[PDB]
Ligand SMILES: O=P(O)(O)OC[C@H]1O[C@@H](O)[C@H](O)[C@@H](O)[C@H]1O
């Protein structure tokens with residue numbers, strides 16, 4: 001006997017500002033780091049960018065009407081920092097606040113609960129220009145200022161907030177792999193920026209306790225649960241190293257205010273540990289979140305890796321299956337293909353049991369409620385004559401993950417809600433428009449902008465059915 | 475770049491009263507549950523019992539002189555509760571207290587640190603007869619009276635104390651597997667007795683803070699870290715289930731005062747959860763220990779197990795290799811042979827890297843210091859002419875574990891000490907005398923006490939060197 005989904009379970013879907021909004025220079029909006037970065041040659045798939053994206057800024061009324069038709073209980077979206085503070089720092093742009101106020105109003109008028117992500121990777125370029133953005137403690141005061149603005153403005157209508165979206169991704173990709181702005185490959189700077197982001201997250205959770213006393217806040221972590229390749233002790237040890245370095249390094253800070261000691265000692269042995277200042281620990285430890293947000297797509301299997309072994313690997317940005325290669329930390333661990341799971345055309349593992357495992361690990365270790373703020377299947381879709389998108393692959397992916405969530409709930413994990421990625425098709429940062437996640441197909445590709453018309457996929461109706469029955473029918 | 479062992483690392487060896495002391499009915503000692511149990515036909519190997527054991531009660535001065543020759547920094551022994559309270563909870567037997575006083579004085583006169591185990595499985599039979607011993611909350615006050623008696627008599631001279639030795643073993647063997655007294659096979663009774671023992675542990679730690687304010691105290695957990703068989707998600711899930719039901723069930727209570735939720739919910743779904751009285755949680759949560767005591771011998775590899783699958787397995791008590799069979803909890807997990815590790819003649823896995831993994835898991839999850847209270851190799855030994863015992867297999871085993879401990883210390887695990895099991899050969903509860911662990915061979919077997927003479931094994935001189943060089947020389 002499975003527990004039922006709780007009565008007010010947030011059946012949701014999600015987007016991110018730069019990926020959907022467009023209107024990149026309208027109504028006072030300032031330059032963001034992604035405005036700049038995406039226009040640099042070779043940074044994105046086929047030079048795609050979010051100048052227009054899917055034009056959600058102008059079509060939000062249509063999109064919300066499709067959410068209402070779907071029956072969504074919740075919609076997760078991010079506020080574009082550069083829309084609200086074009087300089088990051090100076091005067092509020094009221095036109096920018098007015099759009100999100102219009103959007104929230106529309107959501108509530110249709111009975112949809114808004115989930116607002118404060119930061120989804122688009123720090124204003126002015127802050128990067130002024131002081132290096134996440135590499136400077138000044139961004140703590142500046143990020144706080146921007147969040148308190150949003151708290152005061154919308155605290156009365158938005159109950160659920162996410163602080164930083166996938167801090168582990170935009171810090172690592174932006175400062176170690178050089179695939180995100182600022183395009184740096186410097187492990188020392190990476191950990192300094194990561195430590196500052198940790199302090200920013202804690203500071204605004206504290207501010208949230210004052211300005212929105214009845215609300216619920218937490219970060220959203222990009223969680224890939226690690227697996228050992230097999231029962232060889234050296235591979236299990238590699239799994240221990242990988243889970244602590246890739247996952248506990250962030251989630252222990254979110255939940256306990258402390259870095260894990262083995263990873264710290266390893267970084268300290270190389271001078272790579274972050275600069276701690278007086279008060280940092282007191283701040284980090286005095287900022288408990290209401291939940292752990294989890295973005296989940298896949299697990300990662302690892303094995304032992306010699307000190308001279310694999311480092312950076314190839315990542316599949318083209319959808320040509322089988323082109324990614326193993327990556328790792330020399331001496332600690334390396335990724336390896338898990339022969340027991342299928343993979344997508346971008347080589348992502350399809351592992352719905354991995355989601356239950358991951359939910360269990362977080363409940364077991366931190367004792368916190370979980371909001372699944374992203375989960376979904378990115379794949380090619382074909383538009384058929386008659387406005388038919390038969391995305392059975394995506395229905396099956398989502399069905400199996402939702403089934404594992406109910407088993408995790410039965411196991412005692414307190415799951416607050418589930419936000420599928422994504423509501424409409426949107427621009428994938430590094431993969432372009434062909435890597436589609438939406439319940440709603442958007443009519444454009446990487447060559448032609450066409451008309452951006454929305455078309456309901458087969459998965460739209462499946463998920464509408466799920467929400468209708470509170471998950472009882474999948 | 476290995477860290478050295480700390481200057482005052484407690485290089486130790488260990489015993490347990492019933493396995494070593496003999497003198498089972500001398501100087502006013504009462505019956506323990508093991509005096510009665512081992513004299514029941516069929517309960518022990520070839521009917522062996524601890525009536526004489528290796529006669530340490532009369533020979534302790536010889537044995538301590540050998541410890542000083544070895545240069546032991548610490549000696550871990552248990553107090554026989556039935557020596558001190560012949561009927562468990564009446565008047566104190568002063569001759570019983572006088573033996574441990576003479577032993578402790580003998581240790582301290584040779585510069586050896588006493589490490590006292592309050593409970594190593596031998597609750598007096600009178601308490602079993604009166605109210606069922608660990609199945610009654612009456613044992614909480616009776617164990618507290620006995621602990622405080624020792625705290626007051628010896629607290630000036632003993633700083634390191636262990637409360638319950640391997641609660642997970644004596645409770646599950648005594649109440650689920652029927653292999654220890656009282657010989658019960660009842661899962662409901664097992665979890666009730668286990669909960670009472672948790673309360674008795676917390677209560678004595680509370681008392682300890684009052685009577686030995688400068689001392690250090692902890693339980694000693696029988697830790698077998700779990701491995702998944704491979705990266706199949708269902709086997710990783712079995713591993714999550716195993717680590718939670720076999721390990722977190724006890725260690726979360728010791729460290730955090732809380733049972734893990736997924737295991738609790740599974741027990742509750744069957745009416746197997748223990749009876750919780752008001753005040754239980756407050757007591758369990760207000761008894762933090764100074765260290766986690768870790769008894770380590772081997773890892774366990776697990777895979778998925780259907781609801782009709784494996785339950786109880788065969789355990790090797792004869793030293794005939796390849797006689798153990800798989801065990802598990804149907805629906806949750808089953809053990810499986812780990813093809814990457816060697817095994818002893820009793821089918822115990824030899825996995826020194828598993829100790830490093832186990833130490834890392836405890837440090838990472840609980841941030842506690844660890845005292846390794848047992849580790850060693852039980853094997854056949856041959857006495858050759860000239861009183862020579864060349865146990866290079868034991869040296870090899872111990873050397874590799876001590877090396878993995880040093881690597882764990884380098885990772886940042888705070889390891890207080892290392893007690894090898896055992897100082898002299900002694901009675902193995904279920905395996906008789908032929909399964910030897912000692913640094914010191916004792917001349918006797920299952921059929922004759924012979925002369926009980928002590929003979930230093932090759933490993934004696936190896937450990938002596940280890941201690942002399944503080945582990946620099948392994
Ligand atoms: O677009 P991708 O690379 O396929 O990832 C899919 C999604 O999951 C996370 O990475 C991000 O929070 C989203 O913004 C989105 O990018």
Ligand SMILES: O=P(O)(O)OC[C@H]1O[C@@H](O)[C@H](O)[C@@H](O)[C@H]1O
Nearest residue numbers: 490639640643696852902903909
């Ligand atoms: O004697 P065995 O079964 O080989 O195990 C060796 C040791 O195991 C631990 O569980 C006990 O604390 C010791 O008393 C000793 O028995």
